Design an enzyme around this catalytic site. Sequence first.
Site, short mmCIF file in Angstrom:
data_model
loop_
_atom_site.label_atom_id
_atom_site.label_comp_id
_atom_site.label_asym_id
_atom_site.label_seq_id
_atom_site.Cartn_x
_atom_site.Cartn_y
_atom_site.Cartn_z
N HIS A 1 0.84 -1.20 0.00
CA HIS A 1 0.00 0.00 0.00
C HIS A 1 0.88 1.26 0.00
CE1 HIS A 1 -2.88 -3.11 1.41
NE2 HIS A 1 -3.71 -2.43 0.65
N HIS B 1 1.05 1.36 -5.79
CA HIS B 1 -0.29 0.80 -5.78
C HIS B 1 -1.32 1.85 -6.17
CE1 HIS B 1 -4.09 -0.92 -4.53
NE2 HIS B 1 -4.23 0.01 -3.60
N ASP C 1 -8.92 -0.82 -7.62
CA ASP C 1 -8.14 -1.06 -6.42
C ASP C 1 -7.56 -2.48 -6.44
OD1 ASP C 1 -7.03 -0.60 -3.84
OD2 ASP C 1 -8.90 -0.81 -2.76
N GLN D 1 -5.17 -17.29 -2.60
CA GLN D 1 -5.36 -16.45 -3.77
C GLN D 1 -6.59 -16.93 -4.55
OE1 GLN D 1 -3.86 -13.70 -3.01
NE2 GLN D 1 -2.88 -13.37 -5.01
#
Length: 326
Positions: A80, A84, A232, A285
């Site tokens: 972050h 990003h 995002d 994932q």
Amino acid sequence: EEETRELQSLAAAVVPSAQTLKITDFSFSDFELSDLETALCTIRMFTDLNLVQNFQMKHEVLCRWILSVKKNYRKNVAYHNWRHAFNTAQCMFAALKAGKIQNKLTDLEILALLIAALSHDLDHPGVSNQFLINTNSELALMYNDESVLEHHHFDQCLMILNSPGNQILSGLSIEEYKTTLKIIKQAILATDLALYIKRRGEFFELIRKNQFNLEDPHQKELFLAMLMTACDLSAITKPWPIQQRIAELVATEFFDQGDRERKELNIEPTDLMNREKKNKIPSMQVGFIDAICLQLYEALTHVSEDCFPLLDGCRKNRQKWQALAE
Ligand SMILES: CCCc1nc(C)c2c(=O)nc(-c3cc(S(=O)(=O)N4CCN(CC)CC4)ccc3OCC)[nH]n12
Ligand SMILES: [Mg+2]
Ligand SMILES: [Zn+2]
């Protein structure tokens, strides 16, 4: 002053074309770009969306604002960070252009979305909202445990926008300014995944039933929120080499939080924050894709078929992770 030098370098540099910078590509990677180059890409995004022209932005003010945003991300946070935020804005640009979403939104909405995308994780400390609440962090006390990180990101955003020489919204009328700020706040708060999970069902049902209507103000706001999340999370849609690299960064940030929980809260972190459970990454994932990502990219493709590359990439990455989980 190291910062006045950065500003002059940026302001005097030529802004390469969108084509040269490859920023219209959903497969875009920032990995080989310098900090300066990401700033130039950002100027090009504002320029090609007609934001500089329509809102009469001063080049110098835009340059300073971009530099203030970049500097307010923490370089020591593995995921972050500025890269990003920059990639989130790039995905927004690609969705608006290559994905043809720009034709469905107003200039004020596009302006807010781009600012929001660049500003949405400002000063992220690298720990979750629950970690902040459980450690009685000053941020959690400040925002009463509600979308703590996201309120902090919007407050940091506002601070940059209102600070001398960085006022990129100075060309808006007051009514336009109030509207734009309202949308930026909603767009930033939408990036709290808890809120995405809470609101997405309505969006998915409107799409399934062929009732989606952007002229309805509630639906427009809902769509902007969904688009913010789509951008995002877009690293999950990138070509395998890029996604595998970004996933290592995400895991690094998580494992660093787990180290903090061990020392500061004297607890054993959950599997995702436990560095010893690194072998579980592939199955986690797949779980992330199935529960959070796939449905959003499927829905977005119904809104615009030209956003298909995001869904395609997400599906391809699910196959690669599932292969590694057996
Ligand atoms: C908050 C990070 C969101 C995110 N962006 C990307 C590109 C990724 C990614 O690749 N993988 C992960 C990712 C997401 C989950 S999750 O779906 O189970 N989940 C855990 C808790 N979180 C945070 C509060 C919400 C969802 C689990 C493991 C993850 O990454 C392991 C490397 N999350 N992620
Ligand atoms: Mg965030
Ligand atoms: Zn983010």
